[PDB]
Amino acid sequence: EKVQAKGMGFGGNRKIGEYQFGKDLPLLEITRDSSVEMCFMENTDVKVVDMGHKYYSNNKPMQFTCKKTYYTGYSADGYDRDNGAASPTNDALYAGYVIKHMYHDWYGVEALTKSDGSPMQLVMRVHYGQGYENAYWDGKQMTFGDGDTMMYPLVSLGVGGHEVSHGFTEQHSGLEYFGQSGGMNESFSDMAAQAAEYYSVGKNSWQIGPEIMKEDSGYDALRYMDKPSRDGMSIDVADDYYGGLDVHYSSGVYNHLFYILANQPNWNLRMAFDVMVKANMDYWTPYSTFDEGGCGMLSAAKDLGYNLDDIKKSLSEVTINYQSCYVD
Ligand SMILES: [Ca+2]
Ligand SMILES: [Ca+2]
Ligand SMILES: [Ca+2]
Ligand SMILES: [Ca+2]
Ligand SMILES: [Zn+2]
Ligand SMILES: [Zn+2]
Ligand SMILES: [Zn+2]
Ligand SMILES: [Zn+2]
Ligand SMILES: [Zn+2]
Protein backbone atom coordinates (compact mmCIF):
# COMPACT_ATOMS: atom_id res chain seq x y z
CA GLU A 1 0.00 0.00 0.00
CA LYS A 2 1.16 3.52 -0.84
CA VAL A 3 1.03 6.07 1.99
CA GLN A 4 2.13 9.66 2.36
CA ALA A 5 5.73 10.49 3.23
CA LYS A 6 8.13 13.45 3.20
CA GLY A 7 11.11 14.00 0.91
CA MET A 8 14.23 15.97 1.80
CA GLY A 9 16.55 17.21 -0.90
CA PHE A 10 17.86 20.09 -2.93
CA GLY A 11 16.71 22.48 -5.60
CA GLY A 12 17.83 25.48 -7.56
CA ASN A 13 20.71 26.00 -9.94
CA ARG A 14 24.04 27.70 -10.50
CA LYS A 15 22.42 31.01 -11.39
CA ILE A 16 20.02 31.51 -8.48
CA GLY A 17 21.81 29.25 -5.99
CA GLU A 18 20.91 25.96 -4.36
CA TYR A 19 18.41 25.50 -1.55
CA GLN A 20 17.15 22.57 0.49
CA PHE A 21 13.66 21.11 0.88
CA GLY A 22 13.38 20.54 4.62
CA LYS A 23 15.43 23.59 5.63
CA ASP A 24 14.92 26.59 3.33
CA LEU A 25 11.60 25.36 1.90
CA PRO A 26 9.02 22.77 3.00
CA LEU A 27 9.66 19.07 2.67
CA LEU A 28 8.31 17.51 -0.50
CA GLU A 29 5.05 15.60 -0.51
CA ILE A 30 5.95 12.11 -1.74
CA THR A 31 4.45 8.61 -1.52
CA ARG A 32 5.98 5.46 -0.10
CA ASP A 33 5.41 1.70 -0.23
CA SER A 34 6.82 0.31 3.01
CA SER A 35 6.71 -3.24 1.67
CA VAL A 36 9.38 -2.58 -0.98
CA GLU A 37 11.24 0.42 0.51
CA MET A 38 10.36 2.38 -2.66
CA CYS A 39 9.34 6.03 -2.76
CA PHE A 40 7.54 7.81 -5.59
CA MET A 41 7.64 11.44 -6.69
CA GLU A 42 3.86 11.67 -6.61
CA ASN A 43 0.93 12.84 -4.49
CA THR A 44 -2.74 13.25 -5.36
CA ASP A 45 -2.13 16.70 -6.81
CA VAL A 46 1.17 16.28 -8.71
CA LYS A 47 3.13 13.43 -10.35
CA VAL A 48 6.70 13.84 -11.58
CA VAL A 49 7.80 11.63 -14.48
CA ASP A 50 11.51 11.15 -15.21
CA MET A 51 11.57 11.00 -19.00
CA GLY A 52 15.18 9.76 -18.98
CA HIS A 53 15.95 12.12 -21.88
CA LYS A 54 13.42 10.44 -24.13
CA TYR A 55 10.49 12.06 -25.91
CA TYR A 56 7.87 9.44 -24.95
CA SER A 57 7.00 7.64 -21.74
CA ASN A 58 4.46 5.45 -20.00
CA ASN A 59 4.18 8.25 -17.38
CA LYS A 60 4.92 6.05 -14.39
CA PRO A 61 6.07 8.21 -11.46
CA MET A 62 9.76 8.63 -10.76
CA GLN A 63 10.61 6.04 -8.12
CA PHE A 64 13.62 5.84 -5.82
CA THR A 65 14.72 3.56 -3.01
CA CYS A 66 13.98 4.87 0.49
CA LYS A 67 15.35 2.64 3.25
CA LYS A 68 9.53 10.33 8.93
CA THR A 69 11.57 11.67 6.04
CA TYR A 70 13.77 10.39 3.20
CA TYR A 71 16.43 11.83 0.91
CA THR A 72 15.34 12.10 -2.70
CA GLY A 73 17.24 10.92 -5.75
CA TYR A 74 18.38 7.59 -7.16
CA SER A 75 21.37 7.78 -4.75
CA ALA A 76 19.28 8.93 -1.76
CA ASP A 77 21.36 12.10 -1.34
CA GLY A 78 18.75 14.75 -2.24
CA TYR A 79 20.18 15.35 -5.72
CA ASP A 80 19.17 14.67 -9.32
CA ARG A 81 21.80 16.85 -10.93
CA ASP A 82 21.36 18.04 -14.50
CA ASN A 83 22.88 20.83 -16.62
CA GLY A 84 23.73 23.00 -13.62
CA ALA A 85 20.58 22.32 -11.59
CA ALA A 86 20.56 20.43 -8.30
CA SER A 87 17.37 18.45 -8.91
CA PRO A 88 14.85 19.41 -11.61
CA THR A 89 12.59 16.60 -10.40
CA ASN A 90 12.44 18.02 -6.86
CA ASP A 91 11.81 21.50 -8.21
CA ALA A 92 9.01 20.21 -10.45
CA LEU A 93 7.22 18.50 -7.56
CA TYR A 94 7.39 21.71 -5.53
CA ALA A 95 6.41 23.90 -8.45
CA GLY A 96 3.27 21.80 -8.91
CA TYR A 97 2.50 22.18 -5.22
CA VAL A 98 2.82 25.95 -5.42
CA ILE A 99 0.68 26.42 -8.52
CA LYS A 100 -1.98 24.01 -7.26
CA HIS A 101 -2.22 25.81 -3.94
CA MET A 102 -2.15 29.32 -5.39
CA TYR A 103 -5.16 28.58 -7.55
CA HIS A 104 -6.95 26.75 -4.74
CA ASP A 105 -6.16 29.18 -1.93
CA TRP A 106 -6.73 32.39 -3.93
CA TYR A 107 -9.66 31.29 -6.15
CA GLY A 108 -11.11 28.04 -4.78
CA VAL A 109 -10.50 26.38 -8.16
CA GLU A 110 -8.55 23.36 -9.30
CA ALA A 111 -5.52 24.38 -11.37
CA LEU A 112 -6.37 21.53 -13.78
CA THR A 113 -9.88 20.12 -13.99
CA LYS A 114 -11.36 17.15 -15.82
CA SER A 115 -14.36 17.58 -18.11
CA ASP A 116 -16.65 16.37 -15.30
CA GLY A 117 -15.34 19.11 -12.99
CA SER A 118 -13.24 16.88 -10.75
CA PRO A 119 -9.57 17.67 -10.13
CA MET A 120 -6.97 16.67 -12.72
CA GLN A 121 -3.54 15.64 -11.49
CA LEU A 122 -0.63 17.80 -12.63
CA VAL A 123 1.70 15.55 -14.62
CA MET A 124 5.19 17.13 -14.79
CA ARG A 125 7.39 15.42 -17.40
CA VAL A 126 11.01 16.27 -16.45
CA HIS A 127 14.32 15.37 -18.13
CA TYR A 128 12.45 15.54 -21.43
CA GLY A 129 14.59 14.98 -24.50
CA GLN A 130 18.29 15.66 -25.04
CA GLY A 131 19.36 19.27 -24.68
CA TYR A 132 15.74 20.40 -25.08
CA GLU A 133 15.49 24.18 -24.57
CA ASN A 134 11.75 24.57 -24.11
CA ALA A 135 8.73 23.62 -22.02
CA TYR A 136 5.14 23.20 -23.14
CA TRP A 137 1.53 22.20 -22.46
CA ASP A 138 0.09 19.53 -24.76
CA GLY A 139 -3.58 19.37 -23.66
CA LYS A 140 -3.07 17.03 -20.71
CA GLN A 141 0.37 17.42 -19.12
CA MET A 142 3.37 19.74 -18.77
CA THR A 143 6.77 18.95 -20.26
CA PHE A 144 10.10 20.48 -19.30
CA GLY A 145 13.47 20.24 -21.00
CA ASP A 146 16.84 20.24 -19.30
CA GLY A 147 18.09 23.12 -21.43
CA ASP A 148 21.43 23.25 -23.20
CA THR A 149 23.76 26.18 -23.91
CA MET A 150 21.35 29.04 -23.19
CA MET A 151 19.26 27.78 -20.30
CA TYR A 152 19.30 25.62 -17.20
CA PRO A 153 16.58 22.97 -16.78
CA LEU A 154 13.23 24.72 -17.38
CA VAL A 155 11.80 23.86 -13.99
CA SER A 156 11.08 26.83 -11.73
CA LEU A 157 7.98 28.17 -10.04
CA GLY A 158 7.49 30.61 -12.88
CA VAL A 159 7.94 28.16 -15.73
CA GLY A 160 5.79 25.57 -13.98
CA GLY A 161 3.11 28.18 -13.32
CA HIS A 162 3.24 29.28 -16.95
CA GLU A 163 2.80 25.78 -18.34
CA VAL A 164 0.07 24.62 -15.92
CA SER A 165 -1.77 27.85 -16.65
CA HIS A 166 -1.96 27.02 -20.35
CA GLY A 167 -4.08 24.13 -19.15
CA PHE A 168 -6.14 26.37 -16.89
CA THR A 169 -6.81 28.62 -19.88
CA GLU A 170 -7.70 25.71 -22.20
CA GLN A 171 -10.24 24.51 -19.62
CA HIS A 172 -11.79 27.98 -19.03
CA SER A 173 -11.85 30.67 -21.73
CA GLY A 174 -10.16 28.45 -24.31
CA LEU A 175 -8.21 31.36 -25.82
CA GLU A 176 -6.92 29.97 -29.10
CA TYR A 177 -3.14 29.80 -29.40
CA PHE A 178 -2.66 32.16 -32.38
CA GLY A 179 -3.34 35.78 -33.19
CA GLN A 180 -4.45 38.19 -30.49
CA SER A 181 -6.10 35.48 -28.40
CA GLY A 182 -2.81 33.60 -28.47
CA GLY A 183 -0.95 36.65 -27.25
CA MET A 184 -3.51 36.85 -24.42
CA ASN A 185 -3.02 33.12 -23.70
CA GLU A 186 0.75 33.56 -23.45
CA SER A 187 0.30 36.62 -21.25
CA PHE A 188 -2.08 34.94 -18.84
CA SER A 189 0.52 32.23 -18.35
CA ASP A 190 3.22 34.87 -17.71
CA MET A 191 0.91 36.56 -15.18
CA ALA A 192 0.41 33.25 -13.41
CA ALA A 193 4.17 32.78 -13.25
CA GLN A 194 4.29 36.03 -11.28
CA ALA A 195 1.38 34.94 -9.06
CA ALA A 196 3.17 31.68 -8.24
CA GLU A 197 6.30 33.57 -7.16
CA TYR A 198 4.30 36.06 -5.11
CA TYR A 199 2.19 33.38 -3.44
CA SER A 200 5.23 31.28 -2.53
CA VAL A 201 7.97 33.76 -1.57
CA GLY A 202 6.01 36.99 -1.24
CA LYS A 203 7.73 38.78 -4.16
CA ASN A 204 7.93 38.38 -7.93
CA SER A 205 10.55 39.41 -10.46
CA TRP A 206 8.31 40.96 -13.16
CA GLN A 207 10.44 38.90 -15.56
CA ILE A 208 10.04 35.49 -17.18
CA GLY A 209 12.96 33.15 -16.99
CA PRO A 210 15.79 35.10 -15.31
CA GLU A 211 16.22 32.14 -12.94
CA ILE A 212 16.91 29.78 -15.85
CA MET A 213 18.87 31.84 -18.40
CA LYS A 214 22.58 31.06 -18.26
CA GLU A 215 24.62 34.14 -17.43
CA ASP A 216 27.07 33.43 -20.25
CA SER A 217 24.25 33.37 -22.82
CA GLY A 218 24.06 37.15 -23.15
CA TYR A 219 20.45 37.22 -21.95
CA ASP A 220 19.26 38.16 -18.49
CA ALA A 221 15.68 36.94 -18.96
CA LEU A 222 13.34 35.58 -21.55
CA ARG A 223 10.84 38.41 -21.15
CA TYR A 224 10.27 41.63 -19.21
CA MET A 225 6.73 42.48 -18.11
CA ASP A 226 7.38 46.07 -17.05
CA LYS A 227 8.59 47.03 -20.54
CA PRO A 228 8.26 44.10 -22.95
CA SER A 229 10.14 45.79 -25.79
CA ARG A 230 13.32 45.66 -23.70
CA ASP A 231 13.82 42.22 -25.25
CA GLY A 232 14.04 43.80 -28.74
CA MET A 233 11.07 41.89 -30.22
CA SER A 234 8.00 42.08 -27.97
CA ILE A 235 5.45 44.89 -28.23
CA ASP A 236 4.29 47.24 -25.50
CA VAL A 237 0.93 48.39 -26.96
CA ALA A 238 -1.83 46.80 -29.00
CA ASP A 239 -1.38 49.31 -31.84
CA ASP A 240 1.97 47.60 -32.61
CA TYR A 241 0.37 44.20 -33.19
CA TYR A 242 0.37 42.78 -36.70
CA GLY A 243 -0.84 39.49 -38.08
CA GLY A 244 1.91 36.90 -37.88
CA LEU A 245 3.65 38.36 -34.84
CA ASP A 246 4.58 35.41 -32.70
CA VAL A 247 2.52 34.85 -29.55
CA HIS A 248 5.70 35.10 -27.45
CA TYR A 249 6.10 38.70 -28.63
CA SER A 250 2.47 39.82 -28.80
CA SER A 251 2.22 38.65 -25.17
CA GLY A 252 3.83 42.01 -24.38
CA VAL A 253 0.45 43.75 -24.63
CA TYR A 254 -1.26 41.92 -21.77
CA ASN A 255 2.02 41.48 -19.84
CA HIS A 256 2.49 45.26 -19.81
CA LEU A 257 -1.21 45.70 -18.99
CA PHE A 258 -0.95 43.38 -15.98
CA TYR A 259 2.17 45.19 -14.76
CA ILE A 260 0.47 48.59 -15.13
CA LEU A 261 -2.71 47.47 -13.36
CA ALA A 262 -0.91 45.81 -10.45
CA ASN A 263 1.01 49.05 -9.83
CA GLN A 264 -1.91 51.45 -9.89
CA PRO A 265 -2.60 53.29 -6.60
CA ASN A 266 -4.33 50.92 -4.15
CA TRP A 267 -3.78 47.86 -6.36
CA ASN A 268 -1.39 44.95 -6.00
CA LEU A 269 -0.50 41.84 -7.95
CA ARG A 270 -3.21 39.73 -6.33
CA MET A 271 -5.97 42.17 -7.16
CA ALA A 272 -4.78 42.44 -10.74
CA PHE A 273 -4.58 38.64 -11.02
CA ASP A 274 -8.08 38.41 -9.46
CA VAL A 275 -9.42 40.40 -12.43
CA MET A 276 -7.55 38.33 -14.99
CA VAL A 277 -8.58 35.00 -13.47
CA LYS A 278 -12.24 36.01 -13.30
CA ALA A 279 -12.09 37.24 -16.89
CA ASN A 280 -10.50 33.93 -17.95
CA MET A 281 -13.19 31.94 -16.13
CA ASP A 282 -16.29 34.02 -16.92
CA TYR A 283 -15.84 36.40 -19.90
CA TRP A 284 -12.99 35.73 -22.32
CA THR A 285 -13.87 33.69 -25.41
CA PRO A 286 -11.67 31.45 -27.56
CA TYR A 287 -11.51 34.04 -30.36
CA SER A 288 -11.03 37.12 -28.17
CA THR A 289 -9.38 40.20 -29.54
CA PHE A 290 -7.30 42.39 -27.26
CA ASP A 291 -10.23 44.84 -27.18
CA GLU A 292 -12.83 42.22 -26.22
CA GLY A 293 -10.34 41.02 -23.63
CA GLY A 294 -10.42 44.43 -22.00
CA CYS A 295 -14.21 44.40 -21.89
CA GLY A 296 -13.98 41.06 -20.11
CA MET A 297 -11.64 42.60 -17.55
CA LEU A 298 -14.03 45.48 -16.92
CA SER A 299 -16.95 43.09 -16.43
CA ALA A 300 -14.83 40.96 -14.10
CA ALA A 301 -13.73 44.01 -12.11
CA LYS A 302 -17.36 45.10 -11.76
CA ASP A 303 -18.28 41.65 -10.41
CA LEU A 304 -15.42 41.88 -7.89
CA GLY A 305 -16.30 45.42 -6.79
CA TYR A 306 -12.94 46.82 -7.91
CA ASN A 307 -12.35 50.29 -9.35
CA LEU A 308 -13.14 50.34 -13.06
CA ASP A 309 -11.35 53.65 -13.59
CA ASP A 310 -8.04 51.92 -12.84
CA ILE A 311 -8.84 49.20 -15.39
CA LYS A 312 -9.84 51.74 -18.05
CA LYS A 313 -6.70 53.81 -17.45
CA SER A 314 -4.47 50.74 -17.76
CA LEU A 315 -6.26 49.57 -20.91
CA SER A 316 -5.81 53.00 -22.53
CA GLU A 317 -2.09 53.04 -21.63
CA VAL A 318 -1.65 49.86 -23.75
CA THR A 319 -3.90 51.34 -26.53
CA ILE A 320 -6.82 48.90 -26.04
CA ASN A 321 -10.11 50.41 -27.24
CA TYR A 322 -12.66 48.83 -24.91
CA GLN A 323 -15.46 51.23 -25.95
CA SER A 324 -16.55 48.89 -28.78
CA CYS A 325 -17.73 46.32 -26.24
CA TYR A 326 -18.19 48.14 -22.90
CA VAL A 327 -20.40 51.24 -22.75
CA ASP A 328 -21.10 53.02 -19.47
CA1 LIG B 1 -0.97 8.02 -9.94
CA1 LIG C 1 -2.28 14.71 -26.81
CA1 LIG D 1 25.36 21.13 -24.88
CA1 LIG E 1 28.22 28.63 -22.33
ZN1 LIG F 1 -10.61 21.53 -4.52
ZN1 LIG G 1 18.06 15.35 -17.47
ZN1 LIG H 1 3.48 29.59 -23.11
ZN1 LIG I 1 4.82 50.90 -19.28
ZN1 LIG J 1 7.58 31.88 -30.02
Curated annotation (Swiss-Prot):
Q: Where does this protein reside within or beyond the cell?
A: Secreted
Q: What class of enzyme is it?
A: hydrolase
| First-listed, main subcellular location of the protein, grouped into a coarse class | secreted
Which note does the record give on the cofactor? Answer: Binds 1 zinc ion.
Keyword terms: Hydrolase, Metal-binding, Metalloprotease, Protease, Secreted, Signal, Zinc, Zymogen
Catalytic residues as annotated in Swiss-Prot or TrEMBL: E163, H248
Please list the residues that bind Zn(2+). Answer: H162, H166, E186
**A GO biological process held by the record:** proteolysis
Is Signal given among the entry's keywords?
yes
Cofactors (names): Zn(2+)
What's this protein's family per the entry?
Belongs to the peptidase M4 family.
**What is the role of the protein in this entry?**
Cleaves collagen, gelatin, casein, alpha-1-antitrypsin, and bovine insulin. May play a role in the pathogenesis of legionnaires disease.
Descriptive protein name: Zinc metalloproteinase
* Originating organism: Legionella pneumophila
Q: Which residues of the full protein are shown?
A: 208 to 543 of 543
